[PDB]
Amino acid sequence: MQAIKCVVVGDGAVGKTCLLISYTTNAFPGCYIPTVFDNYSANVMVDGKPVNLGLWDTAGQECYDRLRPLSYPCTDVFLICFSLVSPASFENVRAKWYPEVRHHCPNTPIILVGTKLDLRDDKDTIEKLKEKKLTPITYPQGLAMAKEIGAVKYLECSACTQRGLKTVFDEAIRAVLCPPP
Ligand SMILES: Nc1nc2c(ncn2[C@@H]2O[C@H](COP(=O)(O)OP(=O)(O)O)[C@@H](O)[C@H]2O)c(=O)[nH]1
Ligand SMILES: [Mg+2]
Questions:
Q1: What separation in Å is there between the alpha carbon of 180 and the centre of ligand 2?
Q2: What are phi and psi of 81, to 5 degrees?
Q3: CA-to-CA distance for 96 and 12, rounded, in angstroms?
Q4: What are the structural domains of the chain?
Q5: Are strands 49-56 and 41-46 parallel, antiparallel or unpaired?
């Protein structure tokens, strides 16, 4: 029936691959590639609506700044990801990922995703940031960024515990099925 293309962007090490693997397949060996004959699209059904959600991961490296935008054509929604325990990835949304997604696709919906939510309350992770004079991204800080980039939604998730993870992909679909003109 309905086809929705979703592209995930954001810094290396923020959890983009793990977010996709954890949502589609659980377990370390699940780590799938598009070459898998089983399928690439996802079988999702919401409020009686049959949606085939195609998921695309991205090489976040500076080297592939020329090759990564080739997957941007015909994207219905973007997930812009930053790690909630990395302030550098957060400011890379401001300086790189939002300008890049907007330059190539001016009218496509953006969902801002705060990743690694489980590590925001982690005592060791918090101490290690504090040593470098850094702190985790709070819900007000992430919501503030979402407003600055005019994102359709701000969501926080963990791929590791699966907290809020399913909600991210459900909202990606709702951004396309219930837009604003
Ligand atoms: N605690 C924790 N670690 C995570 C989560 N997601 C990814 N990671 C870890 O973060 C690192 C980067 O993950 P990956 O998905 O490859 O990053 P990508 O470069 O953005 O794709 C790996 O060491 C993962 O195990 C998470 O939700 N919680
Ligand atoms: Mg990756």
A1: 31
A2: -110, 145
A3: 13
A4: 1-181 (3.40.50.300)
A5: antiparallel
Q: What is the C-alpha separation between 16 and 65, in angstroms, rounded?
A: 17
* Euclidean distance between CA atoms 44 and 141, whole angstroms: 31
84 burial type by CB count under 10 A (0-12 exposed, 13-18 middle, 19+ buried)? buried
* DSSP per residue, 10-65: --TTSSHHHHHHHHH--SGGG---TT-TT-SEEEEEETTEEEEEEEE-----GGGG
- Angle at alpha carbon of residue 142, lines to 162 and 25, rounded to 5°: 20
Other residues' Cβ atoms within 10 Å of the Cβ of residue 168: 23
**Partners of 83 in the β-ladder:** 115
Residue 112 Cβ inside 6 Å of ligand 1? The answer reads no
Handedness of CA 4, 5, 7, 8 (dihedral sign): positive
User: String of b and e for 92-129 (b: at least 16 CB within 10 Å)?
Assistant: bbeebbbebbeeebeebbbbbbbbbbbbbeeeebbeeb
- Lookup result for tokens 């979703």: 6
Residue 76 CA, distance from chain mean position:
14
- Residue 9 alpha carbon to ligand 1 centre in Å: 14
What single DSSP character describes residue 168?
Answer: H
